[PDB]
Design a protein around this ligand. Sequence first.
Ligand SMILES: Nc1ncnc2c1ncn2[C@@H]1O[C@H](CSCC[C@H](N)C(=O)O)[C@@H](O)[C@H]1O
Ligand SMILES: Nc1ncnc2c1ncn2[C@@H]1O[C@H](CSCC[C@H](N)C(=O)O)[C@@H](O)[C@H]1O
Lengths: 12, 12, 369, 369
Amino acid sequence: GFPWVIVVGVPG
Amino acid sequence: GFPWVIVVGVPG
Amino acid sequence: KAGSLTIVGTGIESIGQMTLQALSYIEAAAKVFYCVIDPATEAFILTKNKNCVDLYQYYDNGKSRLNTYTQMSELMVREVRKGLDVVGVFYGHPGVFVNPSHRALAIAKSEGYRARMLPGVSAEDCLFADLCIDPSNPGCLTYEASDFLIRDRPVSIHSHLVLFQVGCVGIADFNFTGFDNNKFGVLVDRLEQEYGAEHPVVHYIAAMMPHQDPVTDKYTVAQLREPEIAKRVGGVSTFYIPPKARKASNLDIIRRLELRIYPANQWEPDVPEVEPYRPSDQAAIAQLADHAPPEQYQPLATSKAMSDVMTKLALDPKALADYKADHRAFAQSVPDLTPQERAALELGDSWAIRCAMKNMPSSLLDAAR
Amino acid sequence: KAGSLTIVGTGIESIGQMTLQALSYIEAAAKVFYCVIDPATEAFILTKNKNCVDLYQYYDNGKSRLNTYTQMSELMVREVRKGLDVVGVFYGHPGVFVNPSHRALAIAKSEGYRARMLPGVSAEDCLFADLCIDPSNPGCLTYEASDFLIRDRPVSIHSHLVLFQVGCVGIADFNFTGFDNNKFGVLVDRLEQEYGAEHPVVHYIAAMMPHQDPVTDKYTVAQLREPEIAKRVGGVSTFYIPPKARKASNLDIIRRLELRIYPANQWEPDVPEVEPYRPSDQAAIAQLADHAPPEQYQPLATSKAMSDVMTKLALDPKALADYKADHRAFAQSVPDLTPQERAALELGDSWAIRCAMKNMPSSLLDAAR
Ligand SMILES: Nc1ncnc2c1ncn2[C@@H]1O[C@H](CSCC[C@H](N)C(=O)O)[C@@H](O)[C@H]1O
Ligand SMILES: Nc1ncnc2c1ncn2[C@@H]1O[C@H](CSCC[C@H](N)C(=O)O)[C@@H](O)[C@H]1O
């Protein structure tokens, strides 16, 4: 059921 | 004291 | 100086992929901050420590993840500055595609506090287990999907490719009902350019719960444009792109060194069948009949007392802190130890412990200086 | 059909880096085969199961490792064919630079037996924790040192490089008193060619024992020719080669997507100092004062009974086997469950379990179909 636990992002 | 437990080798 | 930060991992699959050291550090912590996905893992953690805070609540719809990550990182560092032993908990490996852990430790370190990351089982660790591949053969390139696109990072058609965060191409923010991943097609274009329309791409999702099966669905690069297929990719989707070809061996390097292995990589296209039981395999197995341990092989020869104390040091961070502060003091006080066991503890080094725990052959010892 | 093979890992550091699922699978096994380095880990394993065999005894001086690996792989498969539930145990991750695990599973699978690898904490997992790096930033290339040389595998000066088995370049065999690693200079030549004499190389050895410190010694590529330095490399040595430069961002890809992070990689040469508390960081932290959990945030709201059973499924492979064979049967029989908890178990899917364990906002639910 759409799990979304993103713990990093890149330049933007 | 020189531990050596290599569990893979490559073509050779 | 008072105050420390230890970041640990839970692994990917619920509870069971947490290491013993992660669990013991959680129990010993003054204050725990966690970011996990499944609520059994969360409930498990709450049984282990009174003072937990869920970091997941610092995410929000339309809220940039950098904000969330600064906030997570600051909540941990603040309790460090109050002199507390703080444990941070992140799903998987706390340092693999995780900003706020590296962030909180670098801050803690730059202000002179004890600052440690314990490793854990990553999604890539799971990928290798579940898809039955070995990074070593034939090598591994690992990228965040968007960084891959934005800095035009080189692929190798002769080595494994692992792509994290394929479910949020270009997305700097967060939403509790996921995202469309409208820029997905952009990745699919880069893959076709580098590998080609027919080239295999494995959609990998590691089971999160003990009873569930992984997703290990192979698609063509071109199939990823079908809406029905593209929509199966989400926030916990990882892509594995196998090699397109074996790479010729180098003649010059073989000389200087004075010179397929089963099993084949099953996700590789036009992969030839590899024989398990070749002659050298059959000869290796025939030897088992008469096999004795070689002379220099050193059997375990230890005691319940030494076994118990070496377990305690690994599992009881209080036992470890005593030992770390005075080897000889600690050793003297452990009951039912042989002098050889006490001596090994007083020295601390791997050789001494091996000599005390193993029946060392007269041969190995000889080597010495 | 009767008989199964499960391969698990112990992690790198003694006992503590074993996962809970690894430990429970070892306890439940009919026959255990292990290949670990330190004897505390070995002694620990022997307390957990009666029927263990040390696979380390199938190594020998001058004996080709392929022979050893075929022999290890066959000893496991044979007990599988007798109808037994066999657990193999390898240090670290049982599938990361490990032939005999992949070998034994592919054989077990090709003869129609249940065949599973559980992931574990690899040396690369430890490397990331101990050297404070993240594969994601700026990407990771991982190779076996000799395969790197022999197939002339491409490096990226803009991404992390990890080299396993730098202590046995060109060596197909084994020796209980290690090796000279005479072909080491060959690797050092390849590194200078690709990175240059002054470029940093980190000599990484993860602490094996709880009380020990890692080796994280930086050298120049040129320093690796000094005999005193080269001789410190051994069978458990891994090299980390940081990037030489940040890679320019791509103008074209930024457009299609409609568009340093702290901390800096400390092993990178001429690395600029990165500010932790920039404005957006200061603004993110100011928000903490008035922060409430967002509406769509879903707090844990579960019971001791549901917590206990979800823990059992993760930690008790017998509990799991019942559940896997009949969800509804298993759920009916668990005591002190609410209907909502029983229902979630009967369905098995992550959403139902999340609804039963979390206080879901009216919003998230709405999404539905
Ligand atoms: N169950 C799962 N199966 C596959 N990939 C997963 C996963 N859970 C997380 N990931 C990967 O991890 C990304 C988030 S980044 C966090 C990674 C985590 N620290 C780890 O150790 O793996 C996801 O976008 C996906 O690429
Ligand atoms: N303590 C340690 N520190 C650093 N690298 C290590 C290590 N123990 C093993 N390795 C690496 O692993 C190689 C053997 S291959 C076995 C790897 C193991 N399955 C894992 O999960 O990591 C060594 O040559 C070295 O490159």
